[PDB]
Amino acid sequence: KTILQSEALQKYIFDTNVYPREHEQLKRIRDATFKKYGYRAELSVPPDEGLFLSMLLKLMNAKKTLEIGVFTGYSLLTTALALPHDGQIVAIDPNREAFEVGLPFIQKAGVEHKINFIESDAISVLNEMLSDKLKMEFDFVFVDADKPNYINYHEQAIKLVKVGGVIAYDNTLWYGSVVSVPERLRASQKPIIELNKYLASDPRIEITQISIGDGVTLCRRIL
Amino acid sequence: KTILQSEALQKYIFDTNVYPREHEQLKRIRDATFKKYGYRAELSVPPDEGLFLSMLLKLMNAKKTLEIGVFTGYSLLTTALALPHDGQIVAIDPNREAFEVGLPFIQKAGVEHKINFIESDAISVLNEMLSDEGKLKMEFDFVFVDADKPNYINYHEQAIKLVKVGGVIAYDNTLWQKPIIELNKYLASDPRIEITQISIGDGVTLCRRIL
Ligand SMILES: Nc1ncnc2c1ncn2[C@@H]1O[C@H](CSCC[C@H](N)C(=O)O)[C@@H](O)[C@H]1O
Ligand SMILES: Nc1ncnc2c1ncn2[C@@H]1O[C@H](CSCC[C@H](N)C(=O)O)[C@@H](O)[C@H]1O
Ligand SMILES: [Mg+2]
């Protein structure tokens, strides 16, 4: 899986610059995820994107983060390992079963204490955060869930992220189809095109769309 | 050029997510670069990589940077615009004529005061910095290496002493040929850095100094 010019080039990146520095428990998540899910393992953040997100989190000095869409936990464990010892993550996914595929390796990595996993749909949780008593504020928000709700998440996340914080959207080049379409991915083409147009014109954010993985768009909140 | 599956996909990134947000003086650098250097305009850091570097510098809170390889100044102006008002950039290139193509637009953007442009080969400039004991602890937050590929490993061993612990050295063109193959192996096995290779532009490898 790649949006690059060649699968060989994608493998060069993995072999040269990811797998030799990949945490062993991240490898364990990858192996377990393919064994259970087959091609659906491609739902995971790819390992080169993971390593990038890790250094991004370190460079921003992020400590409080929100993850919408957990699956078996590759990006969640990536995030927990990058954060300092007192980092805290709110991680939302209706599929607790997938989460428990990765949880033994999260536990082995010693970072379970950083994670608040919420088995729920994200819309209601983020609406409760906005409606809750306390001040929810995040350094970083990773949106990697159900694409038809991405614009809805944006309007929630732009209230919950700090000014100067980052909201990151995954899959924003969607197999190249934003410019094309593989028939089974057609349903998600429109919502990603819609999200791309929405972020492109948003004055409250600075953006960079990065041709890593299946496309990552970073949104730095400035208003 | 693009390392993506299709040129249409690359152009989509530019049209949708770069040009509507691109500083007008960066556009003017792009146009003047084609007018003077033609298809060597391709040597410039591409617009999507520009916004990426800009976002990196803002998130890092970078203030002092070093640029090796300037050409007509697209990445240099990108950097100057991302830095705070009191930011400083040291920019090294033997081609002063190319720099002076972009200079009017750097000046119109109001950021010329941030820039110390040095007309030289970078190896000797950096060796002089390493010799300058008195300013050795005046370190850079960010180093961008975008020059002559056969010297990249040499620049690494200089830059790793010039950048702060926790700062970043960024190598351009790491998905290029031999000096890049060698560089990629060298950084992969360097215990003094953490790395991430990003498939943007011609390939960018970020090196965060940890020792
Ligand atoms: N309404 C919703 N709210 C939150 N998550 C949802 C959701 N609907 C679907 N999802 C979840 O979105 C996930 C997308 S895959 C997430 C991949 C993950 N970031 C990783 O690196 O492994 C799926 O696990 C799915 O269960
Ligand atoms: N020994 C050397 N030291 C510093 N720069 C060098 C060099 N040898 C070649 N170069 C320069 O490296 C540059 C590469 S093109 C640089 C692109 C620039 N960052 C931009 O965005 O426009 C050329 O301008 C060339 O003059
Ligand atoms: Mg993903």
Author numbering:
A (entry chain A): 8 to 139, 142 to 189, 194 to 236
B (entry chain B): 8 to 183, 202 to 236
Show me the paper's own sentences about this structure.
CsFAOMT1 exhibits significant 3″-O-methyltransferase activity to convert EGCG to EGCG3″Me in a Mg2+-dependent manner. In CsFAOMT1, this α-helix is bent toward the pocket, creating a deep and narrow cleft for substrate binding, whereas in CsFAOMT2 the corresponding α-helix is bent in the opposite direction, resulting in a relatively open and shallow pocket. To clarify the exact roles of these residues in substrate binding, we replaced SAH with SAM and then docked EGCG in the structure of CsFAOMT1. EGCG is embedded in a narrow and deep cleft formed by two α-helices, α3, and the bent α-helix α9, with both the A-ring and B-ring anchored through hydrogen bonds. Briefly, Y46 from α3 interacts with the 7-OH on the A-ring. For the B-ring, K156 and two residues from α9, R197 and S201, recognize 3′-, 4′- and 5′-OH, respectively. Notably, both CsFAOMT1-Y184 and CsFAOMT1-Y184R could form a hydrogen bond with the carbonyl group on the galloyl moiety, thereby positioning the D-ring into the active site, which may account for the specificity of CsFAOMTs to the D-ring of EGCG. The difference is that CsFAOMT1-Y184 helps to locate the 3″-hydroxyl on the D-ring close to the methyl group on SAM; substituting the tyrosine with an arginine that contains a longer side chain pushes the D-ring into a deeper pocket, resulting in the replacement of 3″-hydroxyl group by 4″-hydroxyl group close to the methyl group on SAM. Furthermore, we found a hydrophilic residue E49 in CsFAOMT1 that is in the proximity of the 5″-OH of EGCG and might be involved in the recognition of it through water-mediated hydrogen bonds, explaining why only EGCG3″Me was generated by CsFAOMT1. The exchange of a single residue in CsFAOMT1 (Y184) with the corresponding residue in CsFAOMT2 (R184) appears to be sufficient to confer apparent 4″-methyltransferase activity on CsFAOMT1, although the activity is much lower than that of CsFAOMT2.
